[PDB]
Amino acid sequence: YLLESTMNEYIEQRKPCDTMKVGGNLDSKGYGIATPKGSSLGTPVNLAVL
Amino acid sequence: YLLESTMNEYIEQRKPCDTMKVGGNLDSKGYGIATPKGSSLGTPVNLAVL
Amino acid sequence: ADTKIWNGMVGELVYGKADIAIAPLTITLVREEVIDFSKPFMSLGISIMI
């Protein structure tokens, strides 16, 4: 099964302790807080993340 | 010696062959064209990169 | 530190002695402030070489 890096860690940290990660990151995407087009909250929250 | 990933990957395929990429990525960084602030070329570059 | 001089490829680019810089250069926060960038070429990370 394929999934993201951080999701693969947290299942491994829970305690049935039966899942391991092999290999490394196949790529590097990113998580971000998203607002639609025309949302005036997008630019203040973008600076709030920073 | 910690360094860039694909720079570390190139020496591993080049044939002195005594080098090894271990683990995986430890960060995420970007290779972007440095343009002047308010570039004369950047906005044509930004789509032509994409 | 203590003098704030852009040394190498950014020494040509921030100080205006060159226009475009096609290079494996990292977009960082203090890099982003002085001069504009393009999109990342590829996604990478810090890698250990032994």
Task: Count the helix, strand and coil residues of chain C and give each as a percent rounded to the nearest 5.
Answer: 20, 20, 60
Distance (Å) of CA B31 to CA A39, B7, B19, C22, C41: 30, 12, 23, 9, 5
Enumerate residues 6+ apart whose C-beta is below 8 A from B30. C26, C27, C37, C39, C40, C41, C43, C44
* Alpha-helical runs (H) found in chain B: 5-13, 42-49
Show residues of chain C in contact with B19, CB under 8 Å.
49-50
Instruction: Give C2→chain B minimum CA distance, Å.
Output: 24
Residues in chain B after which the chain is broken, C→N over 2.5 Å? none
Q: Which helix H or strand E contains A44, and what residues bound it?
A: helix A42-49
Resolution of this entry, Å: 4.2
**Closest listed residue to residue C6, CA positions, set B42, B34, B43:** B34
Here the tokens at position C13 are 């680019």
Contacts of C14 (CB under 8 A, 6+ apart): C6, C34, C35
Q: Name the residue facing A30 among B23, B25, B28 (closest C-beta).
A: B28
d(CA C42, CA C29): 18
> C49 by DSSP, 3-state: which?
strand
Fill in the DSSP letter of residue C26.
B
